């Protein structure tokens, strides 16, 4: 299994996994 593009990952990642800003600190509910 070859390694795909590095950047693409950063994107593909967000496209799904996305991104949750921690600094925000959303009262209640402690992200796993």
């Amino acid at each position: 299994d070859a390694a795909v593009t590095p950047e693409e990952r950063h994107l593909s990642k967000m496209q799904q996994n996305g991104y949750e800003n921690p600094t925000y600190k959303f009262f209640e509910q402690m992200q796993n």
Binding site: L11, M14, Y19, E20, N21
Partner: protein, 136 residues
């Protein structure tokens, strides 16, 4: 009956800046959520047109995401502080990039954009802004 508030002002610093497009503003429910974001991109996508999306300038500093008019430079459009920012990602196309921001109350607004080619640099300048995978 009474109230008051105040705040400091920004200074002069080298900003990354990122010329892109403005899909528009899409309403959301939660401050986070993938289906909550995509929905926007999708909404705006169909909602407005591709050519409709005006040209803007996404300012990305140490930890601040501001949308200043393309033409004017002293004409802010959207002030998304990496601190305020809650969620951010892309839709079905990496060429797009949306993010949720808390204006004040529990209310949350999402701002999509059209980067070219992809939104790797943009999202990057944002992801890194938030904090990134340890830069220092």
């Amino acid at each position: 009956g009474s109230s008051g508030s105040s705040g400091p002002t920004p200074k002069t610093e080298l900003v990354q800046k990122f010329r892109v497009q403005y899909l528009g503003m899409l309403p959301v429910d939660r401050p986070v959520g993938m289906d909550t974001l995509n929905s926007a991109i999708e909404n705006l996508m169909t909602s407005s047109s591709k050519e409709d999306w005006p040209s803007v300038n996404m300012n990305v500093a140490d930890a601040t995401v501001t949308v200043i008019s393309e033409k004017n430079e002293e004409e802010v459009l959207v002030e998304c502080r990496v601190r305020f920012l809650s969620f951010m990602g892309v839709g079905k196309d990496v060429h797009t990039f949306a993010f949720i921001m808390d204006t004040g109350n529990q209310r949350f607004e999402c701002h999509v954009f059209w980067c070219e080619p992809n939104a790797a640099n943009v999202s990057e300048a944002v992801q890194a802004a938030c904090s990134g995978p340890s830069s220092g």
